[PDB]
């Protein structure tokens, strides 16, 4: 059906591929590809372009954002049992906490300052040293990245060490800053549509548009290229350490460590890789490896090809193409005048993943579609009604609900099928507020979040420091006694007003109800 669309359609209406296949084969194939590239027989990994035009940030103070260093996402932590190295899958929060415990540092900034201000590599920072930190930070674990539309055979992604994550965060922040300084297209506040619009404005003058993707992007970004860029922008010892770890990185496949001298392991440094090209020329609008350029004559095209080759941006001959009337970037397709190309485009379907969260996601998708002119509003209303009917078919059974209130959705035992316009204008029962895209999280969302918080990799017996005062800074240090005092005070306050749990706060509703 995607083939018979009048306009542009990417066929995203279904979910991406998935399977229980082990990640061993994909990771091994990626490592072998990187090794072959290192030999110089498949693709270019030697950077020749000049990056002297990039500004130097060496004088900027060393600043670290603590929030980016803690997350529920996975990471690899290295321990020593009896001489051998053991790589354990944990959460980035737990990995960073273990690193701080080992180094006896109260914050990542203290750790990085200590690392940068040691006399030698053998000097001990807590229970470790910079030499041991560099040795441990070169270990990566492998996993499968599934649900990637257009990739029937899934790719391998990699979990890194917390120390690697710290240094990577510093260098990537500075690389993003340099990218923002280079061109206004790389501003922090710019969506994919805005970047496509700016690209359309940039390339309108010339005749032909080259829409290019790169082949094996991460495997052709060598540690030498990263070091070149980092020295160009002035990262100093942090960049040197990161390049050293990247060169000596090893990937755990099943139960064996495999050396991977080449590549950067699937998007470890997106901004630095982008700078590798952006720092050599200006007639390219690129993000990661998706780029667009414009030209008039074959000589300009040859110059473009030479520029791409010199920056280790190997053009993908299977996807890159030349257009005259369309402009494709970030999966967004526009006309040369900047208008959105007619058709579904990149519109994606909403799978059944909960009676209420599914409706909220469908409402968000339909709002995005109608606002951008993909479809008329009445079509969105009809589709929302159909989705409500399908949700009622899937979920209106005793397994999910025992209620029969009239205001409830038909999928929860009620008899209400609200209109899309009624929901978007808040002209609905308050139970439907959670179905609004800007409304609070749905019941199923909170249930799933709590259950996820209770998983093996995330479960902890620690006492939660929740419902905190909005004047206490998070950089403030605290002991167990402090936690007990704050929790007791908050509990007493809640008991002093007749409550046992804090009331969920929605900023949109609060502002709307304000006199």
């Amino acid at each position: 059906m995607w083939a018979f669309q009048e306009g542009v359609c990417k066929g995203n209406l279904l979910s991406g591929p998935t399977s229980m296949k082990a990640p061993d084969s994909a990771a091994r194939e990626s490592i072998d590809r990187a090794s072959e590239i290192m030999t110089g027989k498949s693709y270019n990994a030697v950077h020749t372009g000049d990056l002297s035009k990039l500004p130097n940030q060496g004088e900027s103070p060393l600043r670290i954002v603590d929030s980016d260093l803690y997350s529920e996402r996975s990471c690899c932590w290295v321990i020593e049992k009896e001489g051998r190295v053991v790589c354990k899958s944990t959460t980035l929060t737990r990995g960073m906490t273990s690193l701080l415990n080992t180094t006896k540092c109260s914050s990542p900034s203290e750790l990085i300052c200590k690392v940068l201000t040691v006399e030698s590599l053998s000097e001990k920072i807590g229970d470790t040293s910079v030499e041991e930190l560099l040795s441990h930070g070169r270990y990566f674990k492998c996993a499968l990245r599934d649900q990637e539309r257009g990739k029937p055979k899934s790719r391998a992604i990699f979990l890194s060490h917390p120390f690697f994550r710290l240094l990577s965060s510093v260098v990537e922040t500075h690389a993003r800053s340099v990218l923002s300084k280079v061109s206004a297209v790389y501003t922090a506040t710019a969506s994919a549509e805005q970047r496509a619009m700016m690209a359309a404005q940039v390339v309108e003058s010339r005749k032909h548009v080259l829409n290019g993707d790169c082949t094996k992007y991460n495997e052709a970004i060598d540690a030498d290229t990263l070091l070149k860029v980092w020295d160009a922008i002035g990262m100093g010892s942090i960049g040197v350490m990161l390049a050293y770890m990247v060169r000596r990185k090893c990937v755990l496949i099943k139960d064996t460590l495999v050396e991977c001298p080449g590549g950067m392991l699937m998007g470890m440094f997106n901004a630095t890789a982008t700078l590798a090209l952006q720092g050599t020329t200006d007639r390219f609008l690129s993000f990661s490896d998706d780029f667009i350029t414009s030209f008039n004559s074959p000589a300009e095209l040859r110059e473009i090809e030479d520029l791409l080759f010199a920056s280790c941006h190997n053009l993908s001959l299977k996807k890159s193409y030349i257009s005259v009337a369309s402009l494709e970037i970030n999966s967004c397709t526009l006309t040369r005048d900047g208008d959105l190309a007619t058709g579904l485009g990149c519109t994606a379907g909403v799978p059944f993943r909960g009676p209420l969260v599914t409706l909220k996601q469908t409402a968000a998708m339909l709002s995005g579609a109608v606002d951008s002119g993909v479809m008329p509003f009445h079509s969105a209303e009809r589709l929302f009604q159909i989705k409500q009917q399908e949700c009622a078919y899937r979920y209106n059974n005793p397994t999910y609900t025992t209620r029969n209130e009239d205001f409830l959705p038909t999928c929860l035992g009620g008899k209400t099928v609200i209109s899309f316009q009624s929901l978007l204008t808040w002209d609905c029962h308050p139970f439907w507020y959670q179905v609004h895209p800007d409304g609070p999280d749905t019941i199923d969302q909170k249930v799933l979040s709590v259950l996820a918080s209770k998983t093996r990799r995330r479960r902890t017996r620690l006492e939660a420091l929740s419902d905190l005062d909005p004047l206490v800074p998070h950089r403030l240090l605290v002991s167990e006694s402090d936690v007990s005092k704050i929790r007791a005070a908050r509990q007493a306050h809640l008991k002093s007003l007749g409550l046992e749990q804090p009331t969920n706060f929605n900023y949109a509703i609060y502002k709307a109800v304000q006199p």
Binding site: N12, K318, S323
Partner: protein
Amino acid sequence: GVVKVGHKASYDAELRERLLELPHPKSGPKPRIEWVAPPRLADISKETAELKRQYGFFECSKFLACGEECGLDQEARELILNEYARDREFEFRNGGWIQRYTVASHKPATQKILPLPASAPLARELLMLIARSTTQAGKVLHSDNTSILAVPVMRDSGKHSKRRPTASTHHLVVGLSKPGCEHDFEFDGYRAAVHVMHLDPKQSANIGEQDFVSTREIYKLDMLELPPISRKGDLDRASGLETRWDVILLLECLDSTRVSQAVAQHFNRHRLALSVCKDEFRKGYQLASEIRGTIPLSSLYYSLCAVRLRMTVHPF
């Protein structure tokens, strides 16, 4: 006094020397890029013909035939499914069926192209039942017009091998279709073709979570007229059926590899392209090596057939 990002440590020179001693990449060859027109109808026809010649077609539609009523009432369907489970010697425990395995051939199953049934009125019910059964496996589950049976597949060890499936246990999904193929099963005067599908939990969840009706409605908003097609996906105006397109959509829902998405992305590029790379853009349509199995292979074949039909009926 405040440490700067460009701060130079005492070990900087040592690490730089170590990096110098470490290996470096060799210069890669410069590629010669030739720009030519995108592929014509003949290239897609050749790809489809190569797939057809290499793999061939199954006699019946197998599980894809489960999208149509089997002609049996609910009680007959339940009886037939339970007696099929008994006939295959599936273990019975706690009122549920379990399939036991001891040894594996470690060879991929034979894969051929499934012919298209006439229609798929029960696509929604089939997807809902697939979603429901794999989380409620063991017993026969019914819908308004069809029923299926999800049987956990667990190893046979001995007296105490395994009683309940775990998060990684696979399921054999068994469904009924009208008789008339090698998979017929007869019991107490009731006849029906029994078709099975071996799915791991992730594939089952992916298949069951798709919204067939909403996807069909969304596709119809800005869609050109669909030609009638034959059992093999060829343009057959005299005797073809348009409803087969629905079946194709159902196949896309059943295919957990979603190779049709790759074909669709490449076809979008093709439709937007004025010039492409010689001999390399065309290879983007050769996705047989990327997948394995009857369902993914059939989905890829029919996606290529859809591209061919679009180029034939509504040239761009």
